[PDB]
Amino acid sequence: ETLRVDPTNDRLSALVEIYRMMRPGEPPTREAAESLFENLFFSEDRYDLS
Amino acid sequence: AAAQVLSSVESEIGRTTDPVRMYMREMGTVELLTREGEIDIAKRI
């Protein structure tokens, strides 16, 4: 059901949706969205579970 | 061709109020006109 209610269809559109939720108003790009999502949880500097 | 993306952006902004974002969108409209461009512009002056 969640997949059904999900308007996104590919990786880039999901990354853009992430960008627009995190940085509303800013027109997202490929590299900006990719860097933002990667730095969210998959960067050892901006994320530590400990 | 930058206002044709700003159209969708402003139609789908996240109710933005920060002047940093508004400025950084509009200064980004105009592209880097340097080197040869700058000399041509300097001659028009």
CA distance B6 to chain A (A): 8
Long-range contacts of the stretch A10-19 (C-beta < 8 A, 24+) = none
CB contact under 8 A, B6 and A25: no
- Chain A residues whose beta carbon lies within 8 Å of the beta carbon of residue B15: 24
Q: Does A7 touch chain B (CB under 8 A)?
A: no
Inter-CA distances, B7 with A15, A45, B10, B16, B19, Å: 20, 36, 5, 14, 18
Identify whether the C-beta of residue B31 lies closer than 8 Å to the C-beta of residue A49. Answer: no
DSSP string, A1-50: -HHHH----SHHHHHHHHHHHHSTTS---HHHHHHHHHHHHS-TTT----
SS (H, E, C) B1-45: CCHHHHHHHHHCCCCCCCHHHHHHHHHHHCCCCCCHHHHHHHHHC
Q: Does A26 touch chain B (CB under 8 A)?
A: yes
